[PDB]
Ligand binder design. Structure first.
Ligand SMILES: CCCCCCCCCCCCCCCCCC(=O)OC[C@H](COP(=O)([O-])OCC(O)COP(=O)([O-])OC[C@@H](COC(=O)CCCCCCCCCCCCCCCCC)OC(=O)CCCCCCCCCCCCCCCCC)OC(=O)CCCCCCCCCCCCCCCCC
Ligand SMILES: CCCCCCCCCCCCCCCCCC(=O)OC[C@H](COP(=O)([O-])OCC(O)COP(=O)([O-])OC[C@@H](COC(=O)CCCCCCCCCCCCCCCCC)OC(=O)CCCCCCCCCCCCCCCCC)OC(=O)CCCCCCCCCCCCCCCCC
Ligand SMILES: CCCCCCCCCCCCCCCCCC(=O)OC[C@H](COP(=O)([O-])OCC(O)COP(=O)([O-])OC[C@@H](COC(=O)CCCCCCCCCCCCCCCCC)OC(=O)CCCCCCCCCCCCCCCCC)OC(=O)CCCCCCCCCCCCCCCCC
Ligand SMILES: CCCCCCCCCCCCCCCCCC(=O)OC[C@H](COP(=O)([O-])OCC(O)COP(=O)([O-])OC[C@@H](COC(=O)CCCCCCCCCCCCCCCCC)OC(=O)CCCCCCCCCCCCCCCCC)OC(=O)CCCCCCCCCCCCCCCCC
Ligand SMILES: CCCCCCCCCCCCCCCCCC(=O)OC[C@H](COP(=O)([O-])OCC(O)COP(=O)([O-])OC[C@@H](COC(=O)CCCCCCCCCCCCCCCCC)OC(=O)CCCCCCCCCCCCCCCCC)OC(=O)CCCCCCCCCCCCCCCCC
Ligand SMILES: C[C@@H]1CC[C@@]2(OC1)O[C@H]1C[C@H]3[C@@H]4CC=C5C[C@@H](OCCC(CO[C@H]6O[C@H](CO)[C@@H](O[C@H]7O[C@H](CO)[C@@H](O)[C@H](O)[C@H]7O)[C@H](O)[C@H]6O)CO[C@H]6O[C@H](CO)[C@@H](O[C@H]7O[C@H](CO)[C@@H](O)[C@H](O)[C@H]7O)[C@H](O)[C@H]6O)CC[C@]5(C)[C@H]4CC[C@]3(C)[C@H]1[C@@H]2C
Ligand SMILES: CCCCCCCCCCCCO[C@@H]1O[C@H](CO)[C@@H](O[C@H]2O[C@H](CO)[C@@H](O)[C@H](O)[C@H]2O)[C@H](O)[C@H]1O
Lengths: 383, 87, 106, 53, 57
């Protein structure tokens, strides 16, 4: 979304109340994260707690492993509720953006003020706490959705093009899954048909081998600040933490069937944090429930059985596919009755163009026959 | 017929290019220079062979205009600039 | 034998079978000039496939309802020998019950 | 009694037929658009920008 | 202005062909899933026989 003066005034008015709310949310989220971190350190697997090293097979560069460095706390409901987890995730996003802004301020001293003016004129990178009314929150969510629309198609195209240009599926079912994974949001994708693509891409690229450009695109699509990007293992850590929290919350909800009892607005927010339900679509409860159930089905029974989600790359592609709107087409069909090269009419046809029209026009067969007969006669005369 | 250009070919002979299958083949066996169907496509042999399509007056059964609902997609975004506007 | 009345299903749309048939006829009428016939063993066209699917669904619905118009059912629904066999059974049952009525009325 | 039995299935079939019709209509629209584009292409009055649009 | 446009132009035909094939594949899958359902209903002869048993014939 482009900056505007109205948004600038809105953010300037709510700057200090927003900061105070952010501080209170910081205290609450620190408490929640302390609880979660203590639980992870106490009951976490040895590999997860010790941060086992996984290196790529080509350049031996360490990155988080989905199986080892990600753990789902099935018994987190006892200590932390689902709402607390959602609050922590939202605060993590807001704190990331605020931390980037504060780092810029510290780095550049008082010279960041005009850049702060540019920042406050757009709701893309302002914390949610800066909105003190429903309309402001709606505009902020619209800005976030616009950023997601801007970023997701590039990530999807990167993934699809790289795979399709460097490899092909093994069997027909994998082919169907791959083809149907990247369909536009206007159509509904069956998670059962699409799931095998997760295994296929695990065969091609796991989350531990994700490239830095693809990571940047994914972070853009997840409203995570990317400047300075730095090493791929920082934003990668951010993504891992966010999706680990999301998976914990999803396991809690699935086990306790909280989504059915969840209210309309809370359900919509839950879907939004999963990148499933844009606000501009004005979805109803039926559609939200359908998409949430599809997400759970895509996770698969193995998620509940062992806490192992499918490949994170393919999962991100699947969820972000809902932001891949059909390519826009505006204008009546009658516009196709016009002509594009009228300005060339005055030029006419030169000798070469006239020759080409004569040879390849309706009289082409006659000219070809005459030319071939003449050439044959000349060749016979020569011999 | 007019003197306007057509879909660009880059001086490539579509009967031997690496993406030849993407160009439909007509009855005469000459692959089209464009994704469309061309009846009078030809090949010329200079130092290198090149495919050429000569526009001509041809009538095609025109399906009646559909409704705007079934082909218009109002997904335009502020950053989006059409190819015509870019041109 | 059947069991019990199945749970109610709500039309997510609303249109009569007559309206649907009229819409199908209108849709297929605009492409008549473009539509081209071909040999049975030759590959089919988009128009032919759309017509076959639409007519198959329509006539299956009609036969389920009770409009036993065999002339069109044998065309737009018969694709397997099993279809022909079950149609023959249905055609004998229907035309036998009709005849028996006249005998039992007279 | 049979009607009460063959009612929900008939409704689902009717809805599926309507959905199939709505799914086929865009295909015909695209075919018409391609026909018009081809018509303009054969006349040498089609720019690449128009085709992409 | 020059390079990216030229490569997009080069891309267009292959993408168009692949998308046409994909649409034809979707239509083919739609057609292949159509089967005429034949349901079996209790023969009325048994009903008539039961009626006779009720008649005590
Ligand atoms: C005055 C001197 C200045 C020097 C120059 C500085 C120049 C600017 C550089 C940037 C400096 C920092 C700016 C502030 C950032 C905010 C604080 C912070 O870390 O937020 C957390 C957050 C951590 O991010 P993450 O990805 O979630 O972390 C993953 C970890 O796994 C996270 O671990 P976890 O998953 O277990 O979760 C833990 C989490 C759990 O906690 C929570 O969830 C609760 C929330 C806690 C964080 C709250 C942050 C709030 C931020 C906003 C603050 C208000 C702003 C208001 C602005 C308006 C004011 C009017 O808590 C944390 O986040 C703790 C992180 C660890 C501490 C980091 C701080 C170390 C430095 C401070 C100590 C210095 C001691 C000096 C001693 C000197 C001795 C001689 O920070 C960021 O977002 C990262 C910074 C982003 C900008 C990077 C820019 C490049 C930096 C390059 C630096 C290179 C070295 C320096 C030389 C530079 C030369 C070029
Ligand atoms: C009070 C407040 C609260 C407290 C403070 C709180 C903290 C605040 C600070 C933190 C805020 C963070 C968030 C900021 C967000 C906004 C960022 C931004 O700028 O957005 C674009 C922003 C508009 O944002 P937007 O409309 O919302 O669109 C956002 C979209 O989402 C579009 O998004 P996008 O992603 O597409 O845009 C991104 C775009 C952002 O960039 C831009 O958009 C470009 C902006 C400038 C464009 C200028 C165009 C016009 C040029 C005019 C030229 C002069 C004309 C003639 C003038 C004649 C005058 C008489 O690209 C980048 O991000 C590229 C980053 C490049 C990084 C460069 C790093 C270099 C490192 C060097 C290498 C080091 C290697 C290591 C070496 C180690 C050695 C040991 O651009 C502008 O507003 C343009 C302003 C132009 C001003 C006028 C022209 C310049 C005037 C200069 C005056 C100089 C006076 C002194 C002269 C002295 C001479 C002696
Ligand atoms: C036709 C001609 C037209 C005119 C042409 C003009 C001539 C141009 C010719 C040359 C052009 C190419 C130059 C390339 C150089 C080499 C670049 C390179 O190697 O980069 C590698 C690498 C590439 O970056 P990346 O992280 O991979 O991603 C870059 C993408 O653009 C990230 O993209 P993204 O999409 O992933 O992220 C989008 C979005 C995502 O959103 C966010 O990330 C959230 C918001 C983040 C806000 C910023 C957070 C910063 C945190 C702290 C960073 C570390 C600080 C270190 C300590 C301070 C050192 C100064 O981020 C933003 O929107 C970034 C906003 C930045 C706005 C500022 C851009 C520069 C405009 C000009 C202002 C300065 C003018 C000075 C000269 C005039 C003075 C009168 O650079 C870095 O790692 C970044 C290091 C940045 C360090 C700080 C800057 C150091 C340079 C000196 C600063 C001097 C300040 C002076 C202040 C005023 C004094 C009076
Ligand atoms: C205006 C400010 C100007 C600032 C200038 C200073 C430079 C820029 C400042 C910083 C800028 C911000 C961005 C920095 C890069 C961030 C990279 C990143 O994202 O890392 C993430 C990464 C976090 O990811 P992680 O998953 O937690 O861990 C990484 C994994 O291990 C990764 O796993 P992996 O599988 O990748 O494991 C491999 C990993 C393993 O390494 C690590 O990751 C561990 C951490 C690094 C360890 C480095 C020390 C190693 C031992 C050194 C022993 C030296 C003994 C010498 C004895 C001499 C006795 C006479 O990497 C390596 O193996 C690399 C080893 C280093 C090789 C160095 C080769 C140098 C060749 C020199 C050639 C000749 C030079 C000229 C001639 C000189 C002589 C005449 O960050 C770190 O681990 C540490 C980051 C540290 C950042 C730099 C801090 C800067 C502090 C500056 C203080 C001084 C300021 C002076 C200012 C002056 C006035 C202006
Ligand atoms: C207007 C113009 C004004 C003047 C401008 C003057 C310009 C000077 C020109 C010369 C500069 C050369 C350096 C260019 C840096 C940019 C390179 C780049 O973007 O490449 C993209 C490159 C391409 O990646 P890709 O193709 O996307 O993916 C490939 C891999 O997948 C990627 O996977 P990955 O990320 O896992 O693997 C990479 C990562 C993997 O490794 C790790 O994760 C482990 C990290 C280990 C860190 C070890 C640090 C050790 C520090 C020891 C300090 C001890 C304390 C000493 C205290 C006392 C002394 C002070 O390792 C690193 O990249 C880190 C290497 C070590 C960094 C050392 C700190 C920066 C030094 C910069 C100065 C160098 C000399 C310059 C002069 C000579 C030039 C010929 O991506 C990266 O490398 C990403 C990280 C970039 C980090 C460097 C930039 C940080 C921001 C700079 C902040 C300071 C700004 C100062 C502004 C000054 C303005 C005047
Ligand atoms: C890249 C471009 C460069 C140019 C530019 O844009 C970016 O740079 C930008 C950087 C900008 C300055 C940044 C910071 C301030 C301080 C502020 O001050 C508040 C009022 C009081 C402090 O509150 C002032 O009271 C002080 O209090 C101090 C003690 O606290 C005392 O010590 C000090 O003596 C005393 O004056 C007054 C505005 C000013 C000068 C800005 C002007 C505009 C710029 C030059 C921009 C400008 C457009
Ligand atoms: C400038 C620096 C800024 C830093 C900002 C971040 C600070 C974070 C502080 C977190 C403190 C957590 O507090 C710490 O938790 C761990 C894990 O439960 C406890 O750890 C305890 O239980 C674990 C798990 O059974 C044992 O492996 C460990 O031996 C034992 O000490 C520590 O006893 C406690 O001190």
């Amino acid at each position: 979304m482009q900056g505007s003066w109205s948004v600038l005034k809105k953010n300037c008015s709510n700057f200090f109340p927003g900061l105070l709310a952010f501080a209170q949310q910081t205290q609450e989220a620190y408490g929640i994260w302390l609880r979660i971190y203590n639980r992870q350190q106490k009951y976490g697997p040895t590999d997860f707690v010790e941060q086992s090293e996984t290196f790529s097979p080509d350049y031996h560069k360490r990155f988080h492993s989905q199986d080892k460095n990600m753990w789902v706390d099935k018994e987190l409901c006892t200590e932390v509720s689902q709402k607390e987890v959602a609050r922590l995730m939202t605060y993590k996003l807001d704190m990331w953006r605020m931390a980037h802004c504060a780092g810029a301020l510290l780095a550049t001293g008082g010279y960041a003020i005009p850049f702060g003016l540019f920042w406050l004129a757009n709701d893309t990178w302002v914390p949610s706490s800066f909105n003190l009314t429903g309309e402001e929150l709606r505009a902020w969510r619209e800005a976030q959705d616009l950023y997601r629309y801007r970023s997701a198609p590039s990530y999807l195209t990167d993934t699809k093009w790289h795979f399709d240009f460097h490899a092909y599926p093994w069997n027909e079912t994998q082919e169907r899954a791959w083809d149907d994974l990247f369909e536009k949001n206007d159509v509904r994708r069956d998670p059962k048909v699409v799931r095998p693509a997760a295994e296929m891409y695990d065969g091609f690229i796991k989350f531990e081998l994700i490239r830095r450009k693809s990571l940047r695109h994914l972070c853009r699509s997840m409203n995570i600040p990317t400047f300075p990007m730095l090493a791929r293992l920082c934003n990668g850590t951010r993504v891992r933490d966010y999706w680990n929290l999301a998976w914990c919350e999803d396991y809690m909800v699935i086990t306790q069937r909280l989504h059915e009892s969840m209210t309309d607005e809370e359900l919509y927010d839950y879907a939004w944090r999963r990148y499933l339900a844009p606000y501009d679509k004005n979805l109803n409860r039926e559609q939200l429930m359908e998409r949430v159930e599809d997400y759970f089905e895509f996770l698969g029974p193995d998620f509940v059985a062992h806490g192992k989600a499918p490949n994170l790359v393919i999962l991100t592609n699947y969820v972000l596919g809902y932001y891949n709107d059909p390519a826009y087409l505006e204008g009546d069909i009658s516009e196709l009755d016009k002509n594009d090269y009228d300005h060339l009419a005055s030029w006419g046809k030169d000798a070469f163009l006239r020759r080409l029209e004569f040879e390849n026009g309706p009289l082409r067969d006659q000219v070809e026959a005459h030319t071939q007969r003449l050439l044959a006669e000349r060749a016979a005369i020569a011999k | 017929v007019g003197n306007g250009p057509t879909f660009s070919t880059g001086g490539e002979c579509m009967n031997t290019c690496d993406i030849q299958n993407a160009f439909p083949m007509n009855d005469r066996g000459v692959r089209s220079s464009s994704p469309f169907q061309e009846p009078n496509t030809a090949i010329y042999d200079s130092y290198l062979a090149w495919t050429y399509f000569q526009p001509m007056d041809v009538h095609i059964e025109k399906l009646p205009a559909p409704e705007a609902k079934y082909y218009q997609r109002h997904t335009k975004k502020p950053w989006d600039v059409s190819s015509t506007e870019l041109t | 034998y059947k069991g019990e009345v199945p749970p109610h299903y709500t039309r997510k749309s609303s249109a009569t079978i007559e309206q649907v048939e009229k819409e199908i006829d209108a849709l297929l009428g605009g492409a008549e000039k473009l539509r081209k016939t071909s040999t049975d063993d030759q590959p089919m066209d988009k128009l032919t496939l759309m017509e076959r699917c639409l007519r198959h669904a329509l006539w299956s619905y009609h036969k389920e309802e009770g409009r036993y118009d065999f002339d069109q059912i044998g065309r737009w629904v018969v694709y397997t020998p099993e279809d022909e066999v079950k149609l023959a059974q249905l055609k004998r049952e229907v035309e036998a019950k009709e005849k028996l009525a006249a005998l039992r009325k007279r | 009694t049979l009607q009460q039995y063959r009612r929900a299935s008939q409704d689902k079939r009717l809805d599926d037929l309507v959905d199939l019709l709505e799914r086929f209509k865009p295909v015909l629209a695209r075919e018409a658009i391609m026909q018009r584009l081809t018509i303009k292409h054969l006349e040498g009055q089609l720019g690449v920008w128009r085709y992409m649009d | 202005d020059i390079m990216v446009p030229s490569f997009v132009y080069n891309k267009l035909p292959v993408i168009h062909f692949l998308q046409e094939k994909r649409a034809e594949q979707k239509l083919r899958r739609v057609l292949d899933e159509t089967y005429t359902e034949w349901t079996e209903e209790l023969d009325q002869a048994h009903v008539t026989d039961a009626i006779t048993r009720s008649l005590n014939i």
